[PDB]
Nucleic acid binder design. Structure first.
Ligand SMILES: Nc1ncnc2c1ncn2[C@@H]1O[C@H](COP(=O)(O)OP(=O)(O)O)[C@@H](O)[C@H]1O
Ligand SMILES: Nc1ncnc2c1ncn2[C@@H]1O[C@H](COP(=O)(O)OP(=O)(O)O)[C@@H](O)[C@H]1O
Ligand SMILES: Nc1ncnc2c1ncn2[C@@H]1O[C@H](COP(=O)(O)OP(=O)(O)O)[C@@H](O)[C@H]1O
Lengths: 257, 257, 120
DNA sequence: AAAAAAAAAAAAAAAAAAAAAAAAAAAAAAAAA
DNA sequence: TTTTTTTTTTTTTTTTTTTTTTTTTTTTTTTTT
């Protein structure tokens, strides 16, 4: 069944180029060449993790000689209430280096060693709100001991937590802020996203004022909502024999959430 | 004594089908196939818990091969003031895997491991109100990390707690409601209940208005209350040498409860 | 330099099929089907190590099922004076499972678990 | 001058981070036959 | 040419101390029209 193949294909995830993504990539590349630490602030379901992650694929570490890998960008997602030891362990795990059983001071020394051996000019920390207040001192300690840029990606809680300590705030003053979709930006994004993700036999008439209206009402500018809504509508539309997404199907999916 | 066997039958619990149960089962099957998080909210004594139990029994784990048995659906019942560590322990023990000792980080790692190895399509959490606010920060983390359709089940209090965090509410936007029985639905439920759950030999027509008024006034549309009343009336009537429910016995029971 | 490229090729390692190796492979397949323990005794500098490694390459890990790797054949090289802890740990690490730091009893149970989950 | 449900100032429950002894058991090995 | 005693050498297994949050329950609300 061809429909089965399309269902399986849609149930996946794909990357669709966007302007804000390119802006973030260029800004972060500038910071990486300057070795200047910074932070990034945005709302949930805006796709900032996808931008931080898509950037790292381009700069994947490649080593041809017998010497160990030289990695320029390392990327870790801390768990809830991640402490100092837990964070160091993740840095070591990402570099495919054997964790040494021992104490926290041993973890600190080992982390400095593995980071000194490789490049690791830029470190992208996601979900920085979850980071425990005790650990930020270690983060900036690393940023000062070695010339490595540190990027703290978080929401408004990141702002709130950072502004409580003077040194951390001084270290991470420069920043980039994400926005939401609206107007022509939103319409162009919907058109581009459907052309990039949907290969349905017939057009969905997305440009129509009414479809844009209901998608705006259900989306509110959050790409993390538009992607899910349109993918579910597509799977359901194809499942009922409709090659294209239809107005009633859109209304149904929007009503469920 | 034949009456003793009948009494044993009446005291033991049984499961019957209802419109709400079938609706929930179809809805949850959809959510499980699409790997989407959702929640179930309704009043107490409406029987939604038994619906979850029946759904689990339908999807029995299958282990044809010598490898780890497939476990499609997981169902956990947290106790009062439940934390993250105990939640992880319950998930681990439900899958017949030993619980290694150590800090919470090890518990998170072990839980992710055992959930990856088995199928673990959808995870259902009964009486979700008992969980602490901090436990949701890990439930949602699992939902984002792996393709599991986490399902929260509880009362109206659940929404009041979920609204405290923007991200938790953003994750769960779909829901199904359970509610009271009334009118023709209530009358049909009573008539069906007399035939299946009760083991009385003759008569006991609860369709009539006189008995319906009693059961309606005492029950208030809650299915669990109805079950209690009918079983007790039948047992007491059998003890009194009666083979059919009589209005006087029905009246006597409800004023004690 | 072309000559240096040829030299770099000659300094490499190659594998050549011999009747000795094929005999060992057929024998090992028989023993695996029979699920019977056995042993191979052979002199030094005979290449039996390479033959066993090639056998391992014949059957690659089968990830075709959705949850575990289901690797049917494992191959470990113990160090000198290999203790029980190091043995269990090598077996565990070969299957991409983290080491549950503890006592040798914990390593024993953990190794049994990962050996049951995988084909082995 | 008489009446008011809402911020500060106080007790239990979990959770995590580090030395510091003590004994057993074995394995080799040098001297002595 | 093996045996006794030494000698070392791993190897393994077990007790005490401190700090930081979260959450909930009374008294105060003086301040306010
Ligand atoms: N550039 C993109 N292309 C395609 N899908 C995207 C993109 N950005 C975000 N998404 C959708 O949004 C989700 C990722 O958003 P998320 O990483 O949760 O945002 P954040 O982590 O910044 O809160 C994915 O499920 C994906 O489908
Ligand atoms: N389909 C059913 N068949 C038999 N008994 C039921 C059914 N649904 C509910 N009940 C009765 O109602 C009670 C169910 O309440 P419960 O499952 O605890 O719901 P809740 O969790 O909302 O309180 C049980 O005691 C059971 O006897
Ligand atoms: N079938 C073979 N193909 C290629 N080289 C071989 C083969 N058999 C032996 N060799 C050579 O012999 C060496 C392998 O010997 P080795 O594995 O050390 O034997 P063992 O360890 O059993 O003494 C390699 O350096 C390799 O070049």
């Amino acid at each position: 069944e061809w429909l089965q193949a399309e269902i399986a294909r849609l149930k996946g995830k794909s990357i669709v180029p966007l302007q804000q993504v390119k802006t973030l990539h260029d800004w972060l590349d500038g910071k990486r060449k300057a070795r200047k630490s910074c932070r990034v602030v945005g709302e949930s379901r805006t796709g900032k993790t996808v931008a931080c992650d898509a950037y790292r694929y381009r700069h994947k570490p490649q080593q041809e000689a017998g010497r160990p890998p030289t990695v320029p960008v390392v990327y870790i997602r801390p768990h809830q209430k991640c402490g100092p030891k837990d964070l160091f362990k993740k840095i070591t795990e990402y570099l495919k280096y054997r964790v040494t059983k021992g104490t926290v001071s041993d973890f600190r020394d080992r982390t400095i060693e593995v980071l000194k051996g490789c490049g690791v000019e830029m470190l992208i920390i996601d979900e920085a709100d979850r980071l425990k207040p005790e650990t930020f001192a270690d983060v900036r300690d690393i940023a000062e001991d070695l010339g490595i840029a540190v990027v703290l990606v978080g929401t408004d809680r990141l702002d709130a937590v950072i502004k409580r300590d003077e040194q951390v705030l001084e270290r991470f003053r420069a920043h980039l802020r994400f926005g939401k979709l609206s107007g022509e930006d939103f319409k162009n994004t919907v058109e581009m996203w459907e052309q990039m993700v949907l290969k349905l036999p017939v057009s969905s008439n997305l440009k129509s004022k009414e479809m844009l209206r209901i998608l705006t009402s259900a989306t509110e500018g959050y790409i993390g909502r538009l992607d899910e809504i349109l993918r579910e509508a597509a799977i359901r539309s194809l499942s009922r024999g409709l090659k294209k997404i239809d107005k009633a199907v859109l209304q149904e999916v929007a009503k469920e959430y």
